[PDB]
Amino acid sequence: PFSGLKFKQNSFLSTVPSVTNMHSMHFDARETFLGVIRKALEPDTSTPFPVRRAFDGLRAEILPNDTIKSAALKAQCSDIDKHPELKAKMETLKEVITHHPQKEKLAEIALQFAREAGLTRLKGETDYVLSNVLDGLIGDGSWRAGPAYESYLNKPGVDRVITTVDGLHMQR
Amino acid sequence: PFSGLKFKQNSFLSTVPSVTNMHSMHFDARETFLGVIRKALEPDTSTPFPVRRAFDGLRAEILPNDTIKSAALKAQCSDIDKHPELKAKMETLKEVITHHPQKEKLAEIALQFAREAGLTRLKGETDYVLSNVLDGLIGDGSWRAGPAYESYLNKPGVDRVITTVDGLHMQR
Amino acid sequence: TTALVCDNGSGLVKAGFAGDDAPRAVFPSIVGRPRHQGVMVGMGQKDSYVGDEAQSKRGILTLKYPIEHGIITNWDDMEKIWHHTFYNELRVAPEEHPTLLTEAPLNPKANREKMTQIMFETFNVPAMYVAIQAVLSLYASGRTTGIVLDSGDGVTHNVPIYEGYALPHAIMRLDLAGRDLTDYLMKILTERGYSFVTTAEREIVRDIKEKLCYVALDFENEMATAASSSSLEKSYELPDGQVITIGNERFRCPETLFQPSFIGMESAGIHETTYNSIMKCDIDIRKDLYANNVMSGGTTMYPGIADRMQKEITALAPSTMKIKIIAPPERKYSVWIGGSILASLSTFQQMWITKQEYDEAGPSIVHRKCF
Amino acid sequence: TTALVCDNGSGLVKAGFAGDDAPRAVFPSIVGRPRHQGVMVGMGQKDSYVGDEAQSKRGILTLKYPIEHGIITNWDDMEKIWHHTFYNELRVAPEEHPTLLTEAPLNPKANREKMTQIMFETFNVPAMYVAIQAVLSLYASGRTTGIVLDSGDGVTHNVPIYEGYALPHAIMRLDLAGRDLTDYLMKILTERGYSFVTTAEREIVRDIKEKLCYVALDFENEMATAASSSSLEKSYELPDGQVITIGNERFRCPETLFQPSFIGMESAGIHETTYNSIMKCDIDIRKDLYANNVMSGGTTMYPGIADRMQKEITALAPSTMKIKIIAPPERKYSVWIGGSILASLSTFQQMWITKQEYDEAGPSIVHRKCF
Amino acid sequence: LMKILTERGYSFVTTAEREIVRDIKEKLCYVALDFENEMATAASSSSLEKSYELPDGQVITIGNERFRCPETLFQPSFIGMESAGIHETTYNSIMKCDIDIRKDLYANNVMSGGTTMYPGIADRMQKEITALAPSTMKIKIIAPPERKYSVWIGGSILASLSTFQQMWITKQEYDEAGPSIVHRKCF
Numbered sequence A, B: 001p002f003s004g005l006k007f008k009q010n011s012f013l014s015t016v017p018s019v020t021n022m023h024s025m026h027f028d029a030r031e032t033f034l035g036v037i038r039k040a041l042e043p044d045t046s047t048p049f050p051v052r053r054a055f056d057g058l059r060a061e062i063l064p065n066d067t068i069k070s071a072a073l074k075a076q077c078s079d080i081d082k083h084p085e086l087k088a089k090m091e092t093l094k095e096v097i098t099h100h101p102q103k104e105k106l107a108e109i110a111l112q113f114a115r116e117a118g119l120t121r122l123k124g125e126t127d128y129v130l131s132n133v134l135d136g137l138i139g140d141g142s143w144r145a146g147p148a149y150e151s152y153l154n155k156p157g158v159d160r161v162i163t164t165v166d167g168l169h170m171q172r
Numbered sequence C, D: 001t002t003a004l005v006c007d008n009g010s011g012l013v014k015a016g017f018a019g020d021d022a023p024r025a026v027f028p029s030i031v032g033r034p035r036h037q038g039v040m041v042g043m044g045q046k047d048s049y050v051g052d053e054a055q056s057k058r059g060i061l062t063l064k065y066p067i068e069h070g071i072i073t074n075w076d077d078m079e080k081i082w083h084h085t086f087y088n089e090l091r092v093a094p095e096e097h098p099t100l101l102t103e104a105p106l107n108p109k110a111n112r113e114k115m116t117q118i119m120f121e122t123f124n125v126p127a128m129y130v131a132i133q134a135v136l137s138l139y140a141s142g143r144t145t146g147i148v149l150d151s152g153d154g155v156t157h158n159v160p161i162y163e164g165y166a167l168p169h170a171i172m173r174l175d176l177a178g179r180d181l182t183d184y185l186m187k188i189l190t191e192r193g194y195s196f197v198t199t200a201e202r203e204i205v206r207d208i209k210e211k212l213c214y215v216a217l218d219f220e221n222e223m224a225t226a227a228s229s230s231s232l233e234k235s236y237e238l239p240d241g242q243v244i245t246i247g248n249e250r251f252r253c254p255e256t257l258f259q260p261s262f263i264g265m266e267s268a269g270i271h272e273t274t275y276n277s278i279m280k281c282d283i284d285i286r287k288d289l290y291a292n293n294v295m296s297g298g299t300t301m302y303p304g305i306a307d308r309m310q311k312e313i314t315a316l317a318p319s320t321m322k323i324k325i326i327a328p329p330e331r332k333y334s335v336w337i338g339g340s341i342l343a344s345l346s347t348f349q350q351m352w353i354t355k356q357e358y359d360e361a362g363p364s365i366v367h368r369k370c371f
Numbered sequence E: 001l002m003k004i005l006t007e008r009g010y011s012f013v014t015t016a017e018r019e020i021v022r023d024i025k026e027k028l029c030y031v032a033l034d035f036e037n038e039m040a041t042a043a044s045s046s047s048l049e050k051s052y053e054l055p056d057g058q059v060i061t062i063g064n065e066r067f068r069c070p071e072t073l074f075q076p077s078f079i080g081m082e083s084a085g086i087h088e089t090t091y092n093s094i095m096k097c098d099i100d101i102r103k104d105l106y107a108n109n110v111m112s113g114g115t116t117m118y119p120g121i122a123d124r125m126q127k128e129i130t131a132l133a134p135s136t137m138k139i140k141i142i143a144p145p146e147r148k149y150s151v152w153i154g155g156s157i158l159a160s161l162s163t164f165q166q167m168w169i170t171k172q173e174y175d176e177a178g179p180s181i182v183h184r185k186c187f
Ligand SMILES: Nc1ncnc2c1ncn2[C@@H]1O[C@H](COP(=O)(O)OP(=O)(O)O)[C@@H](O)[C@H]1O
Pocket: C008, C009, C010, C011, C012, C013, C151, C152, C153, C154, C178, C179, C206, C209, C210, C211, C213, C297, C298, C299, C300, C301, C302, C332
């Protein structure tokens, strides 16, 4: 339905935030991430006008840049089974996202948020709009399992290393 | 003998090279400058045919285009006191050069060649054919001194400036 | 109702009401987001800052310009900029006022179609019109004949107008403006040991350029003068208390306007561009064009640039012609003043692109009713 | 007479004779002074130590690097290293051999002017010359076209050259190199209880980084693997006999080269800079530059970095072009190797800056005969 | 074409870019039989659009610029010139000759040179001249495939005809008459 849709090569590099800023206290891991995807799907001028107009309107309803619209959409997105059009509408975004020529770069960016910002903390109880977007990026759906963080409280390589400064002041 | 010699206003603009090419490792500032001067004195159609031809012959003898001709002229010009005809021809060239309507642009181009590419690095030991040409473009004769470059070792400002990037990797 | 005029330039936004003599809101067009990780609850709660607020907090933000060379490249940031201009600076509802926008000539056609769409859908303006910046600059000069050299932050363009008729085949455009000069000044400031790499330091360099740069009448003699003594050296204080001193860099940076080969570009200088644009007109209007050079834009107020431009054109033009440069002191706002005048004329109220006319034709309507 | 090539890097000093294949002397560029009071008389005590001898006694010394971020800071210490280089390492007299020096691009002009004065007066060399390090790297590779990424201890820079012609407006520089990584590793090693504060211990950490760190092809996947099992853990033996074990710190340290935001830098990674450098060149030479990425310097010796750069550049470049990364096994000495070749060219012998020329023009002559 | 490719965000300003745009014009442009009709079709669908690969790997697509660029041959008003189109110039060129040879000159339109190589330009020429010409007269366009080198082929013919070796100019003649001899001996 959207054949011949072209995209800019690096239009989504300037939107990803700083790696440090992904550790802020009042940081948003969903609104920022969707904004990155929203800029990634923008059709360039090379796309013909009739095809370009169709996609723009659809993106303004599933990936809006505003906050009030996103909040209102998220309210009806939890119980998605009562909106058959939204199920069919978003199902279109499955095919375009997985056919995006920059799919791999977005996936590496997508996992960057998961490792640090943690947008997939609910690991299965993710919003229908957000979980479905991630399915296009990675088809296995393994992101629901877990980002595989490290725990080393046991610390099998126990150190007990005394350095120069530690040598100056040491008890016992 | 050369009355009414009219020239194109912007004939020599297309010949002057870019500033970045002046600092080329293998750049003949002398030959490029003489080519610019040669283009600057091209007789136009408005000039009557006999004087046009005469000036073309004089220009070909004094300002050729072949490398071998330029080298031979320079070699034979070292001991110029034995060729009074060359003296007369060079004086006639000076007289028409000094009345060029575009003298100011030619003078500033000569100064740019001297400063950037070092047209006159011998500061008074320059070739005779260059000496009279430069004297025509600039009559003060001050080009014997030099471009008067700048120096930074006098420490007019003690510096000690530490910006953002320099403040991170600060030693001592 | 009162019209609105909004000159979304490459570097600064000028806005105000039609019929006023000066803009009411002037703020830099930058949108910044934090780049460090916040730690205090209840204090870090915003996502992005717009305009002067981004300038004040530039120490912990990444400043991005939503316009690059007169062409809009980040449309969400542009939506934020327009929203801020309409609501927080002018405090008006755009749904009750027609708007007049500005654009450089030879701009991609998609750029103005999206402007029309954003105005007619997101903000729901009753009507809007797009005008060429250089033409408006001539309105705010009390003239109907001349060649306009407009040079802002992104685009330097020439538009020759004779007796109200434009010669589009003689319109010259050049991508060399204030931002390129700031970048060049940043590049050559490292010769004295001052290194600026971040966006905030880019703003610092831009302020230094605005405050300490001037155009030399004769470049080579000026270079000798600065290299022989210390008369031209001046001191500037960085915001942290450090002091920097610059020398020939004062007049080397604006020199790229006349010799674009410094920054690797092949195009000719602004004077040669002006001469070429004039020489492409009809032979019977060159005499009037030489006498009515109009200069406008922020890049135009380097001290002494008018004299240098006049000298260069005099060298390029025939002797019998009279070269006159017109540089009014208010040329930072000539485009905006002209836009205010044009929207205030009684003969202009029939050329607005109305809401109904856009619905019938689509975004392609802005190509027909506008030049 | 035989020419001398002395590459004053930020970390190491590479010296030798032109025409040789490898530098004869490679010693660290540190100067150490004691920080305790001597009590035992009758044995030779020196106020300072230079080079390897300073390393062997680093338990009692305070080591200082007389070069930082590519610019020489402590001139008195810098003079000592040259004196050590000419007399104790090379066993030669500088009054007889010409010397060729190296310098990073975009350094302050005061740095190279002093290098002329300290060699024509303090050591009285017959002649000298200063060359761009990136260009010398290309000479050793036996090419005449490509884009050079030289990253040493202090400065990472790019210099694209086409058919022996450079594009100065396309030269990029970053102050992000091995010394910055060593400081980063010394910080994240505090996560497991390892503390290193003294300059003596920074040398230990610098050795840990060399023998254990590597660049992962995918950062996320590697992070999950190291967090899942203990496959990536490796052991190191400290000089006092204590043993340390590190896991994911092995590939987190060199990742800063691709994500500079770890250390607070706002600049982009090296792969984006290399791509950004190419796009500043002309359209007809981008095809050759993609296939001739040349690397040199110690910071490039990480295992797997060539593959990671190969993967990243491909994504930003169009699908049609072919990306080839050139990493010769001896690229740690590429700059010096090219230096020996260049000083051995018969054509190059006309470009020296002789002693006679310096006395006529002064230290400023180095700005004209040297790029 | 350079001034018109800016309408899609493509910018070309340097001489190497000049050669690139010239190559695009050679390889993609064509002359539309009805400019007004073709302009509607291009704005209606995307059948006319094609793709070209820039030397550095970027891909550009051009639409109505395919036939708006060569239209300047028929409407020099596009680049601001007051002169008339090439078809009307050819028509005027015939009406300035004697009445008895107009019939033959309608039937022998010979065209040559690279700019004449556009696909369909012969048919547009034929249609325009037929529109200008009287209804009885027969308009025939002769467009040999090698017309890109017609001038050189004609030079080769004329330099090999026997009756030509007496129309040369020789150094001995040059020395006597000077450079002015060229107007007297040649046309
Ligand atoms: N006094 C000044 N001297 C030199 N440059 C200036 C001065 N004032 C402003 N500028 C420069 O002019 C540039 C463009 O200003 P402006 O005319 O507002 O651009 P635009 O036309 O895009 O709105 C700014 O980037 C600024 O650096």
